[PDB]
């Protein structure tokens, strides 16, 4: 029981815990700045720091392991639910493993074929009749014995090992567990080394809300961004073709013939010169190039000098920057739009904002004392514990509606006082 009680300590203290595993990951990277060169630590504040970085890298690694133990107890039964629900609904209603036989696309949808065979297939679904209903439903089109063939110390070889292999399968597809497994080994691979240990500053970005804002902003703004970066690679290359065919003798990195002068006009070392130097210059190309003195190409030299500048640096670099300045602009605008397209209209009655401010201070009363989506969750719990015999007129008209999957009974757009008075 103390093994169970300590495991129940971990799933309880999970969000408390990973908040601390960030704070340790600062304290290494606040201390890992104290190198000198073989690599060795100095000291300025405390006499001992080799003990601290030894004990903290052990203290970090177990706290990295106490999350993945805690996450396996806490959110894995949730993700074992929503997986197991969507199988048993689709096998009952349309019967995809009976009728549709799903194709090569959505492999994880076809992964759930090692679980329909097993015993404990409604393990956590509160509905243990998914095998008997489909044999009752589809025994007229298909053979019932075909369906039963399709469906169905002392404990080490008396447990359903075929269920656990499916149970292990649905775990490793989950992204949040995968990130914790990677965050575990990068504590362990940062125990061999210590500079491939500073990849625990990635926890700054990969929160939750700041993760799905980026994945929304990428799909909305990536295709424009790459193809404007991809435009920059072209117009630089079209200038490289000009300079290499027509201007090639101007590139020098010599001290006026002292060194056996280096060139940048071969095929590629013009282009890789341009995109490495001529972009970052600020003076275009006319800063790491010789001067047009009295040459017979001098008029065509300045045209190449100006129209490299304001076609690449003034214009094409700025509208690259003008995207990402707005692409971070949606990383604050999106999370604020959730917090203010929730306070305008209500969730379920969908009415709006002014219609319960016409009375003094009514929108909180219309929400938190009349519609209050948690109360609807407490209602659906209330029909569960209440016996079926005892339901009143409302609570059985609703409960038959909720069985047959309808949802006309929600107050769509016509809540109580909008028809009364």
């Amino acid at each position: 029981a103390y093994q169970q009680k300590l495991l129940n300590y971990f799933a309880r203290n999970f969000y408390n815990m990973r908040m601390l595993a960030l704070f340790v990951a600062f304290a290494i990277n606040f201390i890992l700045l104290f190198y000198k060169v073989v690599h060795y630590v100095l000291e300025e504040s405390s006499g001992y720091m080799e003990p601290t970085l030894r004990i903290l890298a052990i203290l970090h690694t177990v706290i990295s392991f106490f999350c993945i133990i805690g996450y396996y107890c806490l959110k894995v039964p949730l993700v074992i639910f929503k997986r197991e629900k969507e199988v048993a609904r689709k096998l009952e209603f349309d019967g995809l493993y009976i009728t549709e036989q799903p194709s090569e696309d959505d492999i994880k949808g076809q992964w759930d074929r090692l679980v329909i065979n097993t015993q404990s297939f409604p393990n956590n679904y509160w509905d243990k009749f998914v095998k008997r209903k489909v044999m009752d439903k589809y025994g007229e089109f298909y053979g019932r014995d075909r369906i039963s063939e399709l469906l169905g110390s002392a404990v080490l070889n008396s447990i359903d090992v075929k269920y656990q292999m499916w149970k292990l399968g649905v775990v490793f597809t989950d992204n949040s567990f995968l990130y914790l497994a990677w965050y575990m080994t990068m504590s362990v691979l940062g125990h061999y080394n210590n500079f491939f240990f500073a990849a625990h500053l990635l926890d700054i970005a990969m929160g939750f809300k700041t993760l799905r804002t980026i994945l929304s902003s990428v799909t909305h703004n990536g295709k424009q961004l790459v193809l404007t970066v991809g435009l920059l690679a072209v117009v630089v290359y079209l200038y490289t073709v000009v300079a290499f065919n027509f201007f090639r003798k101007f590139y020098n990195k010599s001290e006026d013939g002292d060194t056996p002068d280096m060139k940048c006009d071969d095929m590629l070392t013009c282009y890789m010169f341009h995109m490495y130097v001529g972009v970052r210059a600020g003076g275009g190309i006319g800063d790491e190039i010789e001067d047009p003195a009295g040459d017979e190409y001098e008029i065509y030299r300045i045209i190449f000098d100006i129209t490299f500048f304001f076609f690449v640096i003034v214009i094409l670099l700025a509208i690259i920057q003008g995207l990402i300045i707005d692409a971070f602009g949606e990383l604050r605008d999106q999370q604020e739009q959730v917090k203010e397209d929730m306070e305008t209209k209500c969730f379920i009655c969908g009415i709006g904002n002014d219609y319960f401010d016409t009375v003094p201070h009514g929108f909180e009363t219309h929400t938190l004392q009349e519609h209050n989506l948690a109360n609807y969750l407490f209602f659906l719990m209330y029909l569960i514990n209440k016996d079926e015999t005892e339901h009143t007129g409302q609570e059985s008209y609703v409960w038959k509606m909720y069985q047959e999957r309808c949802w006309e009974f929600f107050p769509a757009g016509d809540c109580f006082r909008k028809q009364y008075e």
């Binding site: 806490l74 039964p77 809300k209 959730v338 929730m342 109360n375 659906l380 949802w407």
Partner: protein, 58 residues
């Protein structure tokens, strides 16, 4: 009118499931048609019961 329980009252205030409300709130006030929004709300309501059963094992 009905009866919200006692133990079911504190367990929705638990930060265990107060996170799972905040993830569900964020995913329907974004894109999603209202003809299936209440469809998604009940599919949230079915699993939110299942977090109450876990938090009772605490």
């Amino acid at each position: 009118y009905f009866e919200i329980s006692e133990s079911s009252r504190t367990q929705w205030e638990k930060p265990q499931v107060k996170e799972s409300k905040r993830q569900f709130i964020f995913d329907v006030v974004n894109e999603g048609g209202e003809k299936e929004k209440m469809e998604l709300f009940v599919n949230f309501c079915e699993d939110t019961i299942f977090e109450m059963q876990l938090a009772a094992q605490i």
